[PDB]
């Protein structure tokens, strides 16, 4: 009269990303209200994209300072999540718990200087393919870039485009690659004048299309 | 593109700037409620257990999450396995009150016990930084009602806990592995044995 | 009174290691900064080392760094300068500083003067 | 060195006497952010001046600071016979270098 | 919801399974902060 | 030119010619303040939404990047706000910010002032993501002084300012100061904090 139920052998177990709940154990619990509770977020990328943080250059800055050397690179990083000029950034600190990621970066250069300093930038995305990426605004020209100057708006936004082979690309660096599978970004001063002793702050934000996917947890 | 810096204005720009399209966004893998929802280990344990999610590891990957929000409300769901009888308590119960089976008390079944305890705080929401002290004068110790309770057992060998419901509110700095003398964080990747 | 008392100092044989204390006494001591400077007999004053509030910036005169280490404990208010290897030429009156005042908040005020702890090194 | 300070100054009592302090090789501007000391012999110093032009609150309206000729200077009007110790020059030099004078021995005659 | 399956309904009652709300008298902020986020150029264009 | 803007709280009135806007914060209003913790005991005091007056440090060219000085709201205030404070159990209030740095356009350099809840020393890698919080950037070349309102938000729905202090005022250097021959040697930076909101509940005895 009662119904048999064969017990699978290897079901049942324990996984930690189970999608089924617990049984109840304490009854009925009414929580104080918490309507209309300030700040709250509901996706991570969501504060990601609405809030950009700095990056990290030279002796751990998050400026770049125009150069009395003739040299005109001010920075150049690779594109990776894992790079180390990122690795003071919330987007980074997020992406460290997901193997994938696509989508589009977004930079934010803010130039803080005296009105009477004036420059002019320009910002390159050098895709993977070449063994070194340019270290001169001529040769850096011919890759996918912008140009902008100073002026009453100090902020100039620039996003990274997703051009990859595959659809999604890894978070994390292998060891065994001395080229970072995605390309670099490299930021040039073209002209300049009397902005020595200048500084331009670089933020880096979440594109709209960014994505992140495949939760893990290394020891971060 | 061409903002004010000072005002703090989101600027969210595309690749329609230069001639390219957006894409189709999915985001459920960083959707809060999903990320939170999962067993991390509470690894400091002893026979009596007062289950803060501040015992959690900062750099786990729900102890950082975590971390991450000022304030946060979430119900609770543990696995703990014991050698004897497994007692609870909610957040206001006297530490004497452990001893006795009257309260929700779990028996030893054989691999471990899985329980769902609600949140039992008399706060709107628990925070993971709090800047002064209950007591009638360091701000590091976090209240004492900073809790979703204690239990305890003859032993306990392994306690996990999973954030349900969770709700974060206020976000914090949240850091990844620190990067020198390199240009990037290189670490072996699962690559096939071959 | 806004006031800072230093002790410790004493004579010791080169090559030796000590640490000066210095208690301030009639201010929130964590919210102001800590400068050491030693003036020798019949010389002028020199800046030796600078704390912050929180400890998050150090900085030591060229002359003197690497051997000196500064450390407050805003806990206790109390301010310490550890000197190791000490040299014959460090014989100086120390003296344990306060930077702030009403009008000026910086590292460039000077203002609360502790009374000194005489530091005596000599074979 | 670096600085140049008066080693001493003889004033009138109620007079009115200018102190001078400056760099061996350049100018003296507020980046550097000059400060004045008043050291009666076994007193521990009295800050005078700071910023070059400010005085605190329990500092007499006696002394007074200012920027000429591209060096720090320090003015003293009506002189007193409290008046009469060593006066420092401090200036600031990058972070790690905090520049003391030599010291002026100022006598109230 | 969260990370759950289950297409069946649960078997205990809402009032055990979790802790219920209460309210006084959409929500997410940074969500409004991401959707007024402002897109495209500022000036003139060629 | 949309650049002038007048901030009028209580009897008293803030206005700024180089205004960049105004940041709300975690939420454009308040939440609902007669909660089941109150008995409806509590009661809006409008005479201490003012404008009070605060010196928070001198902006000069040796402080590097991620100096940070900070100023928890609830302070010592010695108007209206503090004898409430004083004379009140349980208080709840936003705040309203505006800091002033006033250089000239000939000045370099950028700070950062944020609102933090809750705060907590931060680390130098933490300095690098301060702007997670509800801030505006001061730039001489731009704006004299940055605005930001926040509401009042904690675990508990009143708290006791003497043993909590939810807010804290961080402002951090984010390009160090640059000064020409012709720009300001140093900037003081100053504050006009307002209380918005202000209920109380739990009249104390006198203090003798």
Same mark, same amino acid.
């Given at each position: ?8 052998d ?53 400026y ?21 000029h ?44 070449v ?60 002209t300049?004048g ?16 960014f ?10 | 593109?061409?903002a004010?810096?000072?005002?703090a !204005? ?8 230069? /001639? ?10 960083? !959707?809060?409620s999903?990320?939170? !929802? ?13 289950? !803060? ?6 750099? /786990? ?24 009888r ?76 999973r ?32 | ?67 000196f ?55 | ?36 000391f ?15 032009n ?32 060593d ?23 | ?28 902020? $940074? ?6 986020? $402002?897109?495209?150029? $500022?000036?003139?264009?060629? | ?17 180089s ?40 902006w ?70 301060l ?64 209380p ?13």
């Amino acid at each position: 009269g009662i119904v048999p139920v064969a017990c699978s052998d290897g079901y049942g177990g324990l996984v930690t990303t189970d999608p089924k709940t617990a049984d109840p154990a304490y009854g009925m619990v009414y929580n104080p209200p918490r309507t209309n509770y300030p700040g709250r977020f509901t996706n991570l990328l969501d504060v990601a994209e609405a809030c950009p943080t700095f990056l990290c250059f030279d002796d751990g800055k998050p400026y770049v300072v125009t150069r009395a050397d003739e040299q005109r690179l001010l920075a150049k990083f690779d594109l990776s999540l894992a790079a180390k000029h990122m690795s003071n950034t919330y987007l980074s600190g997020i992406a460290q718990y997901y193997a994938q990621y696509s989508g589009t970066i977004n930079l934010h250069f803010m130039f803080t200087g005296s009105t009477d300093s004036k420059a002019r930038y320009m910002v390159a995305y050098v895709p993977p393919g070449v063994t070194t990426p340019p270290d001169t605004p001529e040769r850096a020209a011919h890759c996918i870039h912008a140009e902008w100057d100073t002026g009453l708006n100090s902020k100039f936004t620039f996003s990274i485009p997703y051009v990859s082979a595959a659809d999604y690309a890894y978070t994390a660096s292998d060891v065994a690659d001395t080229t970072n599978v995605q390309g670099w970004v490299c930021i040039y001063q073209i002209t300049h004048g009397k902005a020595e002793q200048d500084t331009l702050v670089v933020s880096v934000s979440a594109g709209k299309d960014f994505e992140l996917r495949l939760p893990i947890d290394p020891r971060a | 593109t061409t903002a004010t810096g000072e005002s703090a !204005d989101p600027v969210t720009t595309t690749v329609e700037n230069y /001639g390219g399209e957006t894409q189709v966004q999915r985001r459920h893998h960083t !959707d809060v409620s999903f990320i939170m !929802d999962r067993f991390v280990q509470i690894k400091p344990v002893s026979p009596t257990h007062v289950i !803060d999610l501040m015992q959690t590891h900062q750099h /786990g990957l729900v102890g950082a999450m975590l971390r991450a929000a000022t304030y946060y409300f979430s119900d609770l769901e543990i696995v703990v396995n014991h050698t004897g009888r497994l007692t609870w308590v909610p957040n206001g119960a006297p530490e004497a009150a452990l001893d006795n089976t009257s309260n929700p008390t779990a028996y030893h079944k054989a691999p471990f016990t899985r329980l769902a305890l609600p949140y039992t705080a008399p706060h709107r929401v628990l925070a993971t930084v709090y800047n002064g002290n209950s007591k009638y004068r360091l701000a590091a110790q976090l209240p004492a009602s900073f809790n979703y309770g204690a239990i305890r057992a003859t032993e306990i060998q392994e306690l996990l806990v999973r954030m349900k419901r969770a709700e974060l509110y206020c976000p914090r700095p949240l850091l990844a592995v620190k990067v020198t003398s390199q240009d990037r964080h290189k670490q072996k990747i699962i690559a096939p044995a071959k | 009174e806004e006031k800072v008392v230093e002790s410790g100092g004493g004579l010791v044989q080169p090559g030796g290691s000590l640490r000066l204390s210095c208690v301030g006494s009639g201010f929130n001591f964590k919210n102001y900064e800590i400068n050491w400077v030693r003036q020798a007999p019949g010389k002028a004053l020199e800046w030796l080392a600078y704390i912050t509030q929180t400890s998050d910036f150090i900085y030591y005169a060229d002359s003197v760094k690497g051997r000196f280490t500064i450390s407050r404990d805003n806990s206790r208010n109390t301010a310490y300068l550890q000197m190791n290897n000490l040299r014959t030429e460090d014989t100086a009156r120390y003296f344990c500083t306060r930077a702030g005042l009403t009008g000026c908040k910086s590292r460039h005020c000077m203002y609360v003067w502790g009374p000194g702890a005489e530091v005596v090194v000599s074979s | 060195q670096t600085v140049i300070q008066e080693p001493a100054m003889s004033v009138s009592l109620g007079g009115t006497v200018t102190l001078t302090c400056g760099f061996i090789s350049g100018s003296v501007t507020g980046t550097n952010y000059p400060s004045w000391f008043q050291q009666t012999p076994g007193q521990p110093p009295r800050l005078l001046i700071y910023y070059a032009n400010s005085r605190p609150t329990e500092v007499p309206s006696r002394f007074s600071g200012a920027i000429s000729g591209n060096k720090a200077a320090l003015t003293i009007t009506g002189a007193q016979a409290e008046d009469e110790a060593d006066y420092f020059c401090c200036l600031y030099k990058t972070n790690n270098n905090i520049l003391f004078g030599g010291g002026t021995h100022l006598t109230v005659l | 919801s969260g990370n759950t399956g289950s297409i069946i309904n649960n078997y205990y009652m809402q009032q055990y399974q979790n802790s219920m709300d209460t309210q006084l008298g959409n929500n997410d902020w $940074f969500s409004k902060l991401a959707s007024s986020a $402002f897109t495209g150029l $500022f000036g003139a264009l060629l | 030119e949309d650049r002038i803007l007048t901030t009028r709280n209580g009897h008293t009135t803030s206005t700024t010619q180089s205004s960049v806007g105004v940041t709300y914060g975690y939420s454009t209003g308040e939440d609902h303040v007669s909660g089941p913790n109150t008995s409806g005991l509590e009661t809006r005091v409008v005479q201490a939404e003012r404008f009070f007056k605060k010196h928070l440090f001198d902006w000069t060219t040796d402080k590097p990047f991620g100096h940070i000085e900070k100023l928890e709201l609830p302070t010592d205030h010695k108007g209206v706000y503090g004898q409430l404070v004083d004379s009140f159990a349980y208080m709840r209030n936003g705040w309203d910010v505006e800091v002033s740095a006033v250089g000239n356009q000939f000045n370099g350099g950028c700070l950062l002032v944020a609102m933090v809840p809750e705060f907590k020393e931060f680390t130098t890698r933490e300095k690098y993501q301060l702007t997670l919080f509800p801030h505006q950037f001061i730039s001489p070349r731009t704006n004299m002084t940055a605005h930001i309102t926040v509401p009042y938000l904690g675990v508990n729905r009143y708290d006791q300012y003497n043993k909590h202090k939810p807010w804290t005022l961080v402002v951090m250097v984010v390009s160090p100061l640059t000064t020409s021959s012709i720009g300001a040697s140093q900037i003081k930076v100053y504050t006009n904090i307002a209380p918005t909101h202000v209920h109380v509940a739990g009249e104390l005895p006198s203090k003798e």
